[PDB]
Design a protein around this ligand. Sequence first.
Ligand SMILES: [Co+2]
Ligand SMILES: [Co+2]
Ligand SMILES: [Co+2]
Ligand SMILES: [Co+2]
Ligand SMILES: [Co+2]
Ligand SMILES: [Co+2]
Ligand SMILES: [Co+2]
Ligand SMILES: [Co+2]
Ligand SMILES: [Co+2]
Ligand SMILES: [Co+2]
Ligand SMILES: [Co+2]
Ligand SMILES: [Co+2]
Ligand SMILES: [Co+2]
Ligand SMILES: [Co+2]
Ligand SMILES: [Co+2]
Ligand SMILES: [Co+2]
Ligand SMILES: [Co+2]
Ligand SMILES: [Co+2]
Ligand SMILES: [Co+2]
Lengths: 176, 176, 176, 176, 176, 176
Amino acid sequence: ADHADAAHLGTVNNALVNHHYLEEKEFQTVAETLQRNLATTISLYLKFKKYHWDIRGRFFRDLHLAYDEFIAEIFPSIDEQAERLVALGGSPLAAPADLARYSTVQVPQETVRDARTQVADLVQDLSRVGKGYRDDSQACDEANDPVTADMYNGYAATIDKIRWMLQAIMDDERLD
Amino acid sequence: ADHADAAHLGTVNNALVNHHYLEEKEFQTVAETLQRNLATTISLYLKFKKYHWDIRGRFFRDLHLAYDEFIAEIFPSIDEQAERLVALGGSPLAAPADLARYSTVQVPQETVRDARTQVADLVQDLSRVGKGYRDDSQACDEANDPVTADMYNGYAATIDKIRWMLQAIMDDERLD
Amino acid sequence: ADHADAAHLGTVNNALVNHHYLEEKEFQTVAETLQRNLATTISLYLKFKKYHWDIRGRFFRDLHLAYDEFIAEIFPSIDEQAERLVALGGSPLAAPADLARYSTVQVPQETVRDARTQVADLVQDLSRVGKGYRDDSQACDEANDPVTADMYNGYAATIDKIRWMLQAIMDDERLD
Amino acid sequence: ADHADAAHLGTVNNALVNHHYLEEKEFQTVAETLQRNLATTISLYLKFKKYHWDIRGRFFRDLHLAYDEFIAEIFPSIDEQAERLVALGGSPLAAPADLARYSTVQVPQETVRDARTQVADLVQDLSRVGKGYRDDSQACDEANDPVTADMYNGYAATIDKIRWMLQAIMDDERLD
Amino acid sequence: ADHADAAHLGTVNNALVNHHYLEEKEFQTVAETLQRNLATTISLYLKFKKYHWDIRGRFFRDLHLAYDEFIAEIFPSIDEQAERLVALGGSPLAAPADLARYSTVQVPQETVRDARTQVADLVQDLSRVGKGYRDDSQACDEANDPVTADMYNGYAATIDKIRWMLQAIMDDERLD
Amino acid sequence: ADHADAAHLGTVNNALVNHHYLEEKEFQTVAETLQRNLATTISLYLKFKKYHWDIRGRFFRDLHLAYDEFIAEIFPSIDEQAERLVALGGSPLAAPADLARYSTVQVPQETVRDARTQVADLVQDLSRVGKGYRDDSQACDEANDPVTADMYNGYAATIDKIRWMLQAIMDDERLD
Ligand SMILES: [Co+2]
Ligand SMILES: [Co+2]
Ligand SMILES: [Co+2]
Ligand SMILES: [Co+2]
Ligand SMILES: [Co+2]
Ligand SMILES: [Co+2]
Ligand SMILES: [Co+2]
Ligand SMILES: [Co+2]
Ligand SMILES: [Co+2]
Ligand SMILES: [Co+2]
Ligand SMILES: [Co+2]
Ligand SMILES: [Co+2]
Ligand SMILES: [Co+2]
Ligand SMILES: [Co+2]
Ligand SMILES: [Co+2]
Ligand SMILES: [Co+2]
Ligand SMILES: [Co+2]
Ligand SMILES: [Co+2]
Ligand SMILES: [Co+2]
């Protein structure tokens, strides 16, 4: 949570870095959410891709294409969240080990062929991520950062929407 | 190298998977290069992004924009290499831990402000990656896979080109 | 295989026709592959269309749309392969009877409603066509025609990709 | 003419097929024209292509380019006519042997270099096809199918237009 | 052939220049082909333009427009070949005197009105250039540079195609 | 200056060529400026490219990209000036030797790495070219050719603009 703060490195070309209009503790609150959400988004991209590549069965086209649509929707938020953190005097992480540590979403290491399995996995992730943005929006606003909060409201709407579609798809006993 | 083979899982919806026109050992040769290059490309994307976000100094615009241009050039190869592996009866990895293990490129975990530092780091990566594709192209062709080999020839030209630009930028004593 | 050679017609406006930088036997090798692949591509277009038009059942949208996507991918190769043959002093065939004779793919004359049936039919075609291009690429290169060979490497990657998607779709016991 | 009717196959996934608002004999009348015109259009595409690829002489550019323009104009009608037949409970043919049987246009199997020859050949085809659509439009309307009839009126205008241009080109004694 | 090597200038901002993954002799082989082809392409552009501007007669539109189409096809290769040379530690020449020396194509200094004359001139150039790329592709591959070789395969296909069209146009006794 | 006049060749397909609404001496005045400016523009393109390809150092991105922007601005004028000459009964030169003779800009044959060097070289060229168009515009107008004059006014504005940017870049003691 403090591993994202880059205003006190004391290193070259870092002298002017500060937390703009946010107090130290407010930045701590916001930066925690930004770094966490950044790792999560990137991880969702990788996860959607993995399932995108490994899916097989009669619902191959449905999920393979849907995953890319979902990726297109969330991809822009990767750069947006990272630079928002930067604009606040923070440094975004992007290394595999940092992704693994801060992401609320785990990317599979196994080959998942089964459709219900991928979907249920994704649906649980999205419920968690969607509520995550709702809660982070409120936290940021309280932390006096309506700007980041605003960004989260948009992201939230997108996650919630994707959540609905995937949940709808798996709400079927004939699926399997 | 065998952790990429998905033709013998014996799991549901995997019965038809095979290595198309490649023999078992030929697939082993090709799949090694595909999974390795896949991890590397994704890692380059993350690395270019990290430096993109952390760069500061009078050359901020030059490198910040150049990194995005470079990303746009290599990004398409992520899906292309992964699905090429899939079309050959393989399963592409994408999880942070898999990226870390198979990538020939390491994504920084520290905040690098210095321009020469980012560049020299990237230049060494690209010399390695560029030659990597040249060597993998020859290997695949020998393995009777002129198709993948062809893909690598294109990727190689792009890496070599990016390598040149970054090397040119740092070939300056006044840089620092 | 020699019915594609147009450099010795002795007819009007044919005096300058020759096999460019290829020897007579080399052209024979290349032209065989070009005319065969031309007939095959056109036949695949017609076949994808036929199934596109006749499919019914709960997977109508999946296959009906996928077939058009696949067509869009291979269509450009029709003109490209035909004119490549022409640039080498050959004459491409396109008449129904020529298509039937040289194509490695047969277009159905019956109305196939069943999805597994269309798919399995197509998958077998693609395994054959995909390997066909791989083998023809090697043959052309040996025949001193790296140019045509290059064209085949690209086509091959596309066929192999389509092969994967269709095979994945039918790898399901619940399909039927 | 009855080989196009697919409402009585009694096969799987065919139970709901019927002739919509057309009586049995009316469908017979319309389907005859649809299947015939479908084969003809596809055959015109192949023929325009063949001449496109084989033309030589000082009028190479004129005809080579004109043929592609003409193809672009009629190509869309291939899918449109086939699916119109389908929407009426019919099954469109597309196999080489079916094309050869129902088309009013024959695709050349020989290499035609001569310009006047290709043109005169095409002009006769178009006079026949153009009048064909005019007559089929009237037949369909009488058969209570103003919808298909409407489609033919459009196609007719396009054929008649192409007919004019080609006829104009060959109306020259200096041509040869 | 060595006037293209820029890895040993010992001048400012040249310290890092090297031949990437190619040995010294391999670069010599590749660079010879790159500089030669670069001069040739630029010269073809100028030549196509000259004839484009000077053509007169009843075939003015055919050739004037065709020349621009041909230019559009080869133009991109100017920057591509030059930077490929650069990425390998070479320096591309572009001065008139360098063009004249290394080009396998000579740009006319006289006003050529006659169509057959321009065409036959161009056709001979293209046979030479087309075979040139075929031979250079093999040479580069042997020199362990499948990447440049790949670039040449593409260029070759374009030259061979243009060669065909122009040869076809002049294969006519009524031309003059 | 008279090597550009093509109204008196007495050769085939040249019978109708004349100087439109310009008198013989007026054409001589205008054609001199047109051929000179044509050679110059083409030479600027080649020169911008050469420096584009050879630049190295910390200002690589600035100049490499700026040169292409500048090229895009002046490129259209190559065809425009050449055909303007043609419309007046002249024949544009384009051969390397003609470029070298009539251009007021010399393309480098050496590899220039240094930024100040390229820039100062270019700035001197542009001052010369910019004033060249201003003076040629007045000359043409006096020669009763407000049309060509108009073309030059536009070109002039573009050269003057490019001149400013490059001069601004080098107006720095820290450059080197
Ligand atoms: Co702080
Ligand atoms: Co579906
Ligand atoms: Co950004
Ligand atoms: Co808002
Ligand atoms: Co295996
Ligand atoms: Co800069
Ligand atoms: Co994909
Ligand atoms: Co290639
Ligand atoms: Co022959
Ligand atoms: Co064509
Ligand atoms: Co019926
Ligand atoms: Co359709
Ligand atoms: Co209407
Ligand atoms: Co050297
Ligand atoms: Co014409
Ligand atoms: Co460039
Ligand atoms: Co005169
Ligand atoms: Co022009
Ligand atoms: Co004006």
